[PDB]
Assembly symmetry: C2
Homo-oligomer: 367 residues x 2
């Protein structure tokens, strides 16, 4: 059981230019769909880039540079304090030299840990989180940047048709918990366990493997060392289609509430911000970290037409409709991402100080 602190974070999502706005959006139960970032250009100069360099780069890379800078600000570290250090960079995102999304960050901030990009569709950011946790657990890095990014070139419910594709970016700075506590870092939440697996041989692309969904969740729980009943909230995969959604709900019940009546609260960001593809996992993780930090459960928007082969009155699974203070139950939450490609991931996070956030520099943006 190897505890990893989230010592800093930043992000940007539809209807939410920074994490305070993201928290307002989610906690008020607002939707920015009913899915683009309103980018106002970039400041290449701040990053030692020319306008020509910037015009030839993938804009996802420029956005990651800003947001990584802002995550360092949130953690209370200036870039000069991080340069030259053994810090890994793990990015979930789709490239348009294929590693450039991670390598730009390592180059600009002079980070010397492994620098890797993964693309496993909606699970990409959770898979990047898993590479970071393995690196931290093995002592290969002292800290890790984990990000998800996507810029574009109804669920648990009978009207479910898949979502509006959306944009988004999120960045976490991670360190081993004992190291964070000794340095006086901010600790927004603790990652207790994360697991990844694959569906294997299935009949086709959108055909889920229920056993693999159970397995990845049971594995993350085992790594976390926590009782299933202690996990109070799950940010679900929320595929938005009856068969996989039903499969998901039964798999949650089987793993988390087998022979139990303890309430389990389920949610999803997708009705609030759409489906941010490679950034989906990171939107979910940031939501959950914010919930744990503020000790509150945010409203779930959809679910308003229950599925046909699932009794929501024989299970203790439920959907919160209001902003509520955390129930009388442990500060533990989980996040799932089960991608059509075959890859599944599931993470377990826990709630629970004196380095102060730095102000974000004022960037001078142009297109």
């Amino acid at each position: 059981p190897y505890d990893i602190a989230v010592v800093g974070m930043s992000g940007r999502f539809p209807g939410a230019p920074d994490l305070d706005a993201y928290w307002r959006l989610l906690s008020e139960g607002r939707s920015a769909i009913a899915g683009l970032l309103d980018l106002e250009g970039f400041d290449p100069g701040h990053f030692h880039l020319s306008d020509a360099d910037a015009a030839a780069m993938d804009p996802q890379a420029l956005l990651l540079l800003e947001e990584t800078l802002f995550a360092f600000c949130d953690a209370g570290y200036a870039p000069d304090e991080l340069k030259g250090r053994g810090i890994g960079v793990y990015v979930g995102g789709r490239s348009r030299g294929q590693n450039y999304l991670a390598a730009n960050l390592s180059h600009h901030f002079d980070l010397r840990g492994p620098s890797t990009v993964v693309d496993t569709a909606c699970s990409s950011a959770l898979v990047a989180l898993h590479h970071a946790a393995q690196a931290l657990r093995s002592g290969d890095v002292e800290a890790a940047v984990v990000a998800g990014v996507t810029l574009l070139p109804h669920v648990f419910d009978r009207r479910a048709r898949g979502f509006t594709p959306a944009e988004g970016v999120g960045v976490l700075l991670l360190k081993p918990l004992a190291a964070a506590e000794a340095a006086g870092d901010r600790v927004h939440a603790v990652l207790k366990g994360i697991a990844v697996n694959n569906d294997g041989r299935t009949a086709g692309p959108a055909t889920p493997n229920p056993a693999a969904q159970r397995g990845v969740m049971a594995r993350a729980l085992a790594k976390a060392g926590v009782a299933a009943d202690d996990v109070t909230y799950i940010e679900t995969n929320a595929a938005g289609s009856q068969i996989p959604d039903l499969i998901e709900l039964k798999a949650i019940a089987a793993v988390y509430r087998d022979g139990s009546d303890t309430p389990c609260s389920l949610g999803s960001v997708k009705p609030n911000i759409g489906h941010p593809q490679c950034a989906e996992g990171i939107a979910g993780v940031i939501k959950t970290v914010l919930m744990l930090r503020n000790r509150a459960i945010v409203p779930f928007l959809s679910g308003r037409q229950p599925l046909e082969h699932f009794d929501f009155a024989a299970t203790p699974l439920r959907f919160e409709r209001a902003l509520t203070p955390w129930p009388d139950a442990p500060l533990l939450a989980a996040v799932s991402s089960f991608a059509d490609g075959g890859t599944n991931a599931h993470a377990v996070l826990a709630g629970r100080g004196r380095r102060a956030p730095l102000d974000r520099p004022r960037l001078a943006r142009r297109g």
Copy 2:
């Protein structure tokens, strides 16, 4: 110190249709350049693929399917014995859904571990090896397939101009050593330690960071728990350009032979088969595994015009010109890959039974 057995392997390189031919090529000191595989088509049917499916797939994927099958044969496992198991797939290769190189394997062989592709240029296969070792060390998989693949769309020496681009593929099956020993698996060699890092902020693309090259090698050695003097042979990065080659040789001396006169034998496959891009690391690892298994050092082909700012008569570094039995020194070797992109990797391997290889099925190939 976590020991990982290579329990099976297969591969194909210029002038070498299988590993026995590869060993003949290397041990005789032959060159297939002075860089294409002579592919005779594929057998889609054997893999439950139609000709139309196969014609629309990346041929690197079809080649990986064959070679993974052949690595399982070499390990003595039929596919039916591996299906459904917690086996990860880690592929170094450049995709033309970006994870398809790994996902095809997981799908076809029904492997349920994480399935990931990495592209960090020449270090891709060593980076994939590092993800596999982390997964095995953390108990996330019981075994791992690691591959490198490239199909195309003078060194330590004054004539050095970079190499002929080349094709290649290699696949390893890995398990924890104690598990391999208990199951009676073949053990071709043991991976003792592997490390990855990044150059960070450099003046430009082909500008090496000597401190990062020292650091990645010193880290792999520390993870391996072995004395530097016990490593007898290094398959070098061998960039093929005076400045990085000189940097490499000084970094080897500083890390491996600091205050020591113990001989250290250096080599490279690149004069034999060219530069197989994403498969470079895997060609190097397979070479070294074969050397350790046969207890022999193969000839080095180039180095015949020493560099201008390096005394090859004050260091104990040397280049073997003949096939020689292993010297009177431990059966330990290392492999480096330092990519222009920023990524460096270094692995340490050791030499040292009754499951028998299966015959390769006869595939019926067509274009």
